[PDB]
Design a protein around this ligand. Structure first.
Ligand SMILES: Nc1ncnc2c1ncn2[C@@H]1O[C@H](COP(=O)(O)OP(=O)(O)O)[C@@H](O)[C@H]1O
Ligand SMILES: [Zn+2]
Ligand SMILES: [Zn+2]
Ligand SMILES: [Zn+2]
Lengths: 481, 101, 635
C-alpha cells in the first residue's frame, strides 16, 4: 500500500538502506571493527567502548565543518550494512546521497534527542557530504576497463597541473520582465528546468523569462590531470593521464606535484562533436568524480636550548656523513639562523661560497641544507642561466627562486657557469636584496631577501695553495667581495 | 541604450545591456508590429568607461612549483587607468561571473 | 534508384552450415563438441573471448568431403566478407546458447533486471483483460583466427601491398606499431529512459558518430502523446574497450626510394592492450573503411579513409641446466667476452668491461647500482659496431646518437602534447649507448648529470612538469677533437670533456690505433675473413652462442651477492694504495666515486661466478683492471 522507492534496476530499497546505515552509525563502536580486522590481540578497550561515529559527529557540530571522513571496511564490520558494502562497489552515486542525507538527519536527531539547546537553522543550513575512503584494493590506470563504468574506485597518482576554479550552477535564478517576480529552479544533469511563464497567476505572461547570471548560486569544480605513479608503471610506456574532477570543499585540496591516493566514481560522458550540434562522438571521455582525497610543543626546543653542548650537536646533525669541515657546517648553520630583518635596510643573512673539487662531497651538503630548511630551493648553475633564476615573462610572470625563497636558502650548484646577465642580476641580489625588471609594459620591484649558498668548480685539476686560489675561480671579484 | 524602430521611428530608450548587446523586441507603438531591425542611437545613448586588468597572486603567497592563477578585474567609471601593470595593489568590490557571449 | 543483382552465395544455407558446424565439429587430433564447451564456459562466465579458427572450418569441410557431401565453401565466404559473418556467427551462437551450470550472481547484472521488468511490461500491456537488440545481451567478444599450413589471409602482406580491393576481406599484415592510444570506452547500445512513461529505448551504434534521441518512442508514451524527455543512462549502456593504434611498414618491405606508410588498427573487446609500441607484430583483421558523417562526407565525397579491425594478434618474438653446462664448460669470462661481437679481434679487458656493463652492480636502500663505461678511443677502431652489438645482445636497449634526450612532442592524436619517450626513457632498466660523446648538444650536456645522479628525466614543457623513469646504465663513445694521441696533448684537453662529468663517471678505456705488423695481420685476415664465407666466420675457438647470454645475465642480475668484512678491509687498503698512486701525464686521481665503481666491478664479477662471497683474487683483478685503465690513461 505504501509506494516505496527502488534504486533503478537494482531491486534495492531506499528504506532498508537508510535504516541500515542509520542504525549502523548509531551503533558502530570500534571494538566490533577490532574483532573483524583481527586486531583482537592488540585491543585498547578504553577507546573501544565509546561510540566511534557519534563522538565524531558531535565534534563536527562544534568545529563547524560538515564533512565526515568514513572508511568502508566498517561496512564489512557491522552486519546490517554488509550487503550495503557491495552497493558501494556497485551503485555509488545513489547510496552516497543516501549516506549524506542520513548524516544530516543524524545531526537533526542528535540535536532534538538529547534536548541540547542548539538552533536548527545552523544545523539545516550547512550541506553535509560523505567522504568514503579505503573501500577496496587500489586499481591501476592500465587495468581500468569499461566494466568499471558507474563504479567506485581508488587511484594512486601525481598531479600534473591544476586548472582554476570552474563555476557550476546549483540553483538557477529567473526573473519576470513585466512583473519582477524572482523565482528559483533546480539544475538537473546540466539542463535548466526553464519555466515557460511565471508561477504568478496575475500576469502569467509567456516568454517573459530572463536569467540573472550573477544572482544564481554556484559551486566549485576543478579538473586535475592525474598521472600514474612511476613505481607501478610498465617499463615500455609513459605514465598515462586521466581527468580527475573535484567539487566543493575538495577543490584546491590537491597541490601540484604531490602524490595522492584519490577515491571517486569512474564515469564516462559523451563528448560533443560540434559546438552548435547535438551529434555526439562514439568515443567517451573518462573522468573520476572525486568523493575523497587522501594525501601521500616548544619544550623540546627549550630542553636543547638550555644545553651547553648544542653547538657540536647541531654541527653533527646537519651533515652526519661528512666528518671534517666543521667550520663549513657551522657557517651553513649560522646561515640557517641568520640575522634579523632591519628597517629604518641592511641584509642580515650571511653568504657562503664553497670552493672545492666536484669529487669532494659538496652537493650532498647542498641536498642536506635543502632538506633541513623550511624555505629554500636547490638549483643548478648549468641548468638555469640568463634571466631564468630571476623573474621572467612567460606565456603571466613566472618568477625564479631568488624571490620565491624569502628568508630561505638558494643553493646553486655548478656556480661557475653563470652568464654575464646572471652576474648582473646577482649583483643586485646581494647588494639591493631586491630584483627589478621592466618587460612587456610590466615594471616589477620584487623583494629578494634571500640567503645564497653557492658551490663553485675550479677549472680542471685541483689547485695548489702556494699561489692564491681566487684567481683560478672563474667568478668575478665583485661577487667574491 | 536608446534604439529607434525602422518602421515607424518610435523611440525605446533605457535598454540595459548586462553582458551582450541587446535590442528591444516589442515596438511600443500599438499600430506597428515590428520585432527586429532596430537602429541604435549613438548620440542619445549613455556610455561608460571600461578597463579590464588581468591580475595574478603575489610571489609571497605562491606555493612550491605552481603556475600563478589569474583573474580578470573590471574597472568602470572613475576607476579606469588607476592601476598600472606590475604593481602590488588591492581592489575592493564585487566578485561576478560572466557567461560565454 | 537501387537496382538489384543476383550473387551465387546463399546466406540461409551458409547459416545452416554454421549452426550445424557449431554442434557437429569436435577436434580429436590432439588427444563432445569443443565449441559447445566454449559456449558453455561463456554461459558460466568463465571466458569472454570466443575465437573461431578457420583451420577448424577447413578441416570440418574436409571431413564433410570425407563423408561424401559437399559444403558451400564457408571459409572463402568468411575471407571475402567477414564483417557480416561476424554478426552471423554471433546470431548462430545466440541461437545455440547453453543453459548456465553454476551460480548466476543475479545481483551484479543490471540488464537482467531491466529485461525482467520489460518482460513484465510486455505481459502486463498485452494481457488485455525484437524487444532488445542482440548486442545488449552479448557478454562475449567474437574474434577470427586465420588458416595456416594448409589462402590470402594465410599469406602475410606488407602495408604497401594492402590495396583498395582488400576492403571487406580478412587480411594479415606485418608491421611495427608506432603509437598506441589509451584504452577508451566505445559504445554499442545507448539506453534512454523516459521520465514520464517509465520505459526505455535502445539505440545501436555502428558509426564513429551518433545522434541522441530527444523524445520517447514508446507505445504507452505515444498513446497519451505526452512529450516525455529521454535521459541517457550509462549504467544500462553497452560498452567495449576500444583502442586505436598505428602500424608502420617494415623497412625491408619498403621499396628503394619510398617512404613507409601507416595504417590504423582498431582493437575492441578483450584484444585491447595486447598491442605495444615498438613491437613487430602480425595482425590478422577485417579491413574495413571508415566513412565520415555530415559535411566532411559531403566535401571529401567518394574519397574515403580506411582502418583495420583486428581479430588476431601474433608476436614475432631447463635454464639452470644450461647454466651448469656453461659452468662445466669452463672459463665463463673469456668465453662470454670473445663470444660477444665476433667481428672484432683481441681487446679482451675492455670487452670484459662491456660484459660487466650488462652485468651491473648491486643497489642499496639511495645509491645507484649502475655501472657506466666509456670508449675514449681513436676513430676507426670499430666504435659503432660495438655499440650496435652491445645493443643486440642486451634487450631493452637502444642505439642513440648525441647529434639523445626525451621530450614531449606536439601533433598527437589529441591536440595536447603526448609524452613521447626519448632514448633515455626506453633504455630504462637497461643500456643506453651514446655515440659521438664529443659531438653532443648543450641541453644533453645538462641532462646527462640528472641521468647519472637522480636517474630521472625532468621535463617542464607547456605548463606540464614531469619526471620520467630512466634507471639507465650508460655506455659512452668519445673520439677526441684530434684523431692522434700524443703525450704533448693532455687527456682532458684532447677529449675536451668537462671535469665534472668524469668526476661523476667511473671507467674510461683508451684503445689506440697503433701500427704493429703482426697485430695488423691478426686483425686483417679476421676483418677480411668475415668477407670470405657467408654470415659469421669460424671462430677458431669455442664458438659463439647468441641465444645463451640473455638468460645467464638475467640470473646474474637475480642473485645480488653480499660481501664480507675482511675483503672490505683489503678494499680499504687497495683504496689507500690508489690514493698513494694519486699522489704520484694524466692528472686523473682516485676518488671515493671511483671506490664505489671498484665496488660495482667487484659484485659484477661476484654476479658472474654465481658466488655468495666476493673473492680476494677477484678484488685484486678488479684493481688490476683499474691499473689497465691507468695504462689506458697513459696510452
Ligand atoms: N675488427 C675490426 N677492427 C677494427 N676496425 C674495424 C673492424 N671491423 C670493422 N672495422 C671498421 O671500423 C669502422 C667503424 O668506425 P667507428 O669506430 O664507428 O668510427 P668513429 O670512431 O669515427 O665513430 C667501420 O667502418 C669498419 O670499417
Ligand atoms: Zn510575471
Ligand atoms: Zn514600429
Ligand atoms: Zn515515454
Amino acid at each position: 500500500s505504501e509506494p516505496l522507492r527502488i534504486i533503478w534496476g537494482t531491486n534495492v530499497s531506499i528504506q532498508e538502506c537508510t535504516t541500515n546505515f542509520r542504525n549502523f552509525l548509531m551503533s558502530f563502536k570500534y571494538k566490533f571493527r577490532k574483532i573483524l580486522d583481527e586486531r583482537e590481540e592488540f585491543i585498547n578497550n578504553t577507546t573501544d567502548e565509546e561510540l566511534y561515529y557519534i563522538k565524531q559527529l558531535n565534534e563536527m557540530r562544534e568545529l563547524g565543518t560538515s564533512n565526515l571522513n568514513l572508511d568502508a571496511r566498517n561496512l564489512l564490520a557491522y552486519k546490517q550494512t554488509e550487503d550495503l558494502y557491495h552497493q558501494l562497489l556497485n551503485y555509488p552515486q545513489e547510496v552516497i546521497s543516501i549516506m549524506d542525507q542520513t548524516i544530516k538527519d543524524c545531526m537533526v536527531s542528535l540535536i532534538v534527542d538529547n534536548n541540547l539547546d542548539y538552533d536548527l537553522d545552523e544545523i539545516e543550513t550547512k550541506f553535509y557530504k560523505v567522504r568514503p575512503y579505503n573501500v577496496g584494493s587500489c586499481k591501476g590506470m592500465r587495468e581500468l576497463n569499461p566494466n568499471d563504468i558507474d563504479k567506485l574506485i581508488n587511484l594512486k597518482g601525481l598531479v600534473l597541473r591544476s586548472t582554476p576554479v570552474i563555476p557550476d550552477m546549483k540553483v538557477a535564478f529567473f526573473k519576470c520582465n513585466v512583473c519582477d517576480h524572482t523565482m528559483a529552479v533546480e539544475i538537473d544533469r546540466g539542463v535548466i528546468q526553464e519555466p515557460a511563464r511565471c508561477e504568478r497567476i496575475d500576469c502569467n505572461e509567456p516568454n517573459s523569462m530572463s536569467l540573472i547570471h550573477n544572482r544564481c548560486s554556484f559551486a566549485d569544480k576543478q579538473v586535475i590531470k592525474l598521472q600514474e605513479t612511476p613505481d607501478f608503471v610498465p617499463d615500455g610506456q609513459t605514465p598515462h593521464s586521466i581527468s580527475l574532477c573535484v567539487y566543493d570543499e575538495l577543490v584546491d585540496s590537491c597541490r601540484a606535484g604531490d602524490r595522492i591516493e584519490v577515491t571517486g566514481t569512474f564515469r564516462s560522458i559523451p563528448i560533443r562533436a560540434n559546438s552548435r550540434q547535438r551529434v555526439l562522438k562514439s568515443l567517451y571521455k573518462t573522468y573520476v568524480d572525486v568523493v575523497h582525497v587522501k594525501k601521500v610543543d616548544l619544550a623540546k626546543i627549550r630542553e636543547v636550548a638550555a644545553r651547553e653542548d648544542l653547538y657540536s650537536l647541531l654541527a653533527r646533525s646537519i651533515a652526519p656523513s661528512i666528518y671534517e669541515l666543521e667550520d663549513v657546517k657551522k657557517g651553513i648553520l649560522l646561515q640557517l639562523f641568520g640575522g634579523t630583518n632591519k628597517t629604518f635596510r641592511y641584509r642580515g643573512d650571511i653568504n657562503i661560497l664553497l670552493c672545492g673539487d666536484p669529487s669532494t662531497s659538496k652537493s650532498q651538503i647542498l641536498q642536506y641544507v635543502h632538506k633541513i630548511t623550511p624555505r629554500g630551493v636547490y638549483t643548478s648553475g648549468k641548468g638555469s642561466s640568463a634571466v631564468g633564476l630571476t623573474a621572467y615573462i612567460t606565456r603571466v610572470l613566472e618568477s625564479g627562486a631568488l624571490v620565491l625563497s624569502d628568508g630561505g636558502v638558494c643553493c646553486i650548484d655548478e656556480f661557475d657557469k653563470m652568464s654575464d646577465s646572471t652576474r648582473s642580476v646577482l649583483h643586485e641580489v646581494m647588494e639591493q636584496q631586491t630584483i627589478s625588471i621592466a618587460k612587456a609594459g610590466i615594471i616589477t620591484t620584487l623583494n629578494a631577501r634571500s640567503s645564497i649558498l653557492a658551490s663553485a668548480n675550479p677549472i680542471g685539476s685541483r689547485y695548489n695553495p702556494n699561489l692564491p686560489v681566487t684567481e683560478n675561480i672563474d667568478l668575478p671579484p665583485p661577487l667574491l667581495s | 541604450a536608446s534604439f529607434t524602430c525602422d518602421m515607424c521611428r518610435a523611440i525605446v530608450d533605457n535598454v540595459e545591456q548586462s553582458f551582450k548587446y541587446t535590442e528591444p523586441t516589442f515596438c511600443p507603438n500599438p499600430s506597428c508590429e515590428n520585432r527586429a531591425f532596430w537602429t541604435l542611437n549613438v548620440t542619445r545613448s549613455r556610455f561608460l568607461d571600461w578597463q579590464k586588468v588581468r591580475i595574478q597572486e603575489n610571489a609571497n603567497e605562491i606555493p612550491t612549483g605552481s603556475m600563478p592563477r589569474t583573474l580578470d578585474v573590471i574597472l568602470r567609471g572613475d576607476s579606469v587607468e588607476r592601476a598600472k601593470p606590475g604593481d602590488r595593489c588591492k581592489f575592493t568590490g564585487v566578485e561576478i561571473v560572466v557567461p560565454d557571449v | 534508384a537501387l537496382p538489384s543483382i543476383q550473387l551465387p552465395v546463399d546466406y540461409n544455407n551458409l547459416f545452416n552450415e554454421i549452426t550445424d558446424f557449431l554442434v557437429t565439429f569436435k577436434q580429436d587430433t590432439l588427444s563432445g563438441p569443443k565449441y559447445m564447451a566454449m559456449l558453455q564456459k561463456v554461459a558460466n562466465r568463465e571466458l569472454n573471448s570466443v575465437i573461431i579458427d578457420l583451420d577448424d572450418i577447413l578441416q570440418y569441410q574436409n571431413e564433410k568431403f570425407l563423408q561424401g557431401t559437399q559444403a558451400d565453401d564457408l571459409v572463402s565466404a568468411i575471407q571475402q566478407n567477414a564483417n557480416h559473418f561476424t554478426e552471423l556467427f554471433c546470431r548462430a551462437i545466440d541461437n545455440n546458447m547453453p543453459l548456465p551450470t553454476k551460480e548466476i550472481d543475479y545481483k551484479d547484472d543490471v540488464l537482467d533486471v531491466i529485461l525482467n521488468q520489460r518482460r513484465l511490461r510486455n505481459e502486463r500491456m498485452l494481457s488485455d483483460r525484437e524487444l532488445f537488440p542482440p548486442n545488449l545481451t552479448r557478454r562475449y567478444f567474437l574474434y577470427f583466427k586465420p588458416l595456416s599450413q594448409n589462402a590470402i589471409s594465410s599469406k602475410p602482406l606488407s602495408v604497401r601491398q594492402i590495396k583498395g580491393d582488400f576492403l571487406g576481406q580478412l587480411i594479415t599484415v606485418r608491421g611495427i606499431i608506432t603509437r598506441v592510444s589509451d584504452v577508451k570506452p566505445a559504445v554499442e547500445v545507448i539506453a534512454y529512459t523516459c521520465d514520464q512513461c517509465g520505459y526505455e529505448v535502445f539505440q545501436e551504434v555502428n558509426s564513429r558518430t551518433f545522434t541522441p534521441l530527444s523524445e520517447c518512442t514508446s507505445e504507452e508514451c505515444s498513446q497519451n502523446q505526452t512529450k516525455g524527455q529521454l535521459f541517457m543512462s550509462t549504467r544500462a549502456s553497452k560498452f567495449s574497450a576500444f583502442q586505436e593504434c598505428k602500424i608502420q611498414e617494415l623497412s625491408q618491405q619498403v621499396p628503394v626510394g619510398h617512404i613507409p606508410r601507416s595504417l590504423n588498427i582498431h582493437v575492441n573487446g578483450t584484444l585491447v592492450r595486447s598491442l605495444s609500441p615498438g613491437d613487430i607484430v602480425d595482425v590478422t583483421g577485417i579491413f574495413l573503411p571508415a566513412p565520415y558523417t555530415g559535411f566532411k562526407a559531403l566535401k571529401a565525397g567518394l574519397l574515403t579513409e580506411t582502418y583495420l579491425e583486428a581479430q588476431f594478434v601474433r608476436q614475432h618474438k631447463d635454464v639452470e641446466e644450461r647454466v651448469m653446462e656453461l659452468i662445466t664448460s669452463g672459463d665463463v669470462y673469456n668465453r662470454l667476452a670473445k663470444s660477444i661481437a665476433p667481428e672484432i679481434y683481441g681487446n679482451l679487458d675492455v670487452k670484459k668491461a662491456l660484459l660487466l656493463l650488462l652485468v651491473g652492480g648491486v643497489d642499496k636502500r639511495k645509491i645507484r647500482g649502475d655501472i657506466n663505461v666509456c670508449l675514449m678511443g681513436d676513430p676507426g677502431v670499430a666504435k659503432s659496431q660495438l655499440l650496435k652489438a652491445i645493443c643486440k645482445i642486451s634487450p631493452r636497449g637502444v642505439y642513440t646518437t648525441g647529434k639523445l634526450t626525451a621530450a614531449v612532442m606536439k601533433d598527437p592524436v589529441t591536440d595536447e602534447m603526448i609524452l613521447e619517450g626519448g632514448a633515455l626513457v626506453l633504455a630504462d632498466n637497461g643500456i643506453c649507448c651514446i655515440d659521438e660523446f664529443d659531438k653532443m648538444d648543450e641541453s644533453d650536456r645538462t641532462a646527462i648529470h640528472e641521468v647519472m645522479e637522480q636517474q630521472t628525466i625532468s621535463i617542464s614543457k607547456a605548463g606540464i612538469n614531469t619526471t620520467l623513469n630512466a634507471r639507465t646504465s650508460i655506455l659512452a663513445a668519445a673520439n677526441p677533437l684530434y684523431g692522434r694521441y700524443n703525450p704533448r696533448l693532455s687527456p682532458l684537453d684532447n677529449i675536451n670533456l668537462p671535469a665534472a662529468l668524469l668526476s661523476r663517471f667511473d671507467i674510461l678505456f683508451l684503445m689506440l690505433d697503433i701500427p704493429s705488423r703482426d697485430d695488423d695481420e691478426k686483425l686483417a685476415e679476421h676483418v677480411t675473413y668475415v668477407h670470405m664465407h657467408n654470415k659469421q666466420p669460424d671462430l677458431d675457438f669455442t664458438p659463439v652462442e647468441p641465444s645463451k647470454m640473455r638468460e645467464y645475465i638475467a640470473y646474474a642480475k637475480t642473485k645480488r651477492p653480499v660481501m664480507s668484512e675482511a675483503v672490505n678491509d683489503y678494499v680499504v687498503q687497495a683504496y689507500i694504495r690508489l690514493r698513494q698512486d694519486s699522489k704520484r701525464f694524466s692528472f686523473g686521481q682516485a676518488t671515493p666515486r671511483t671506490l664505489l665503481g671498484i665496488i660495482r666491478l667487484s659484485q659484477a664479477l661476484a654476479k658472474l661466478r654465481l658466488a655468495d662471497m666476493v673473492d680476494i683474487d677477484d678484488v685484486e683483478e678488479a684493481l688490476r683492471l683499474v691499473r689497465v685503465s691507468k695504462e689506458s690513461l697513459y696510452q
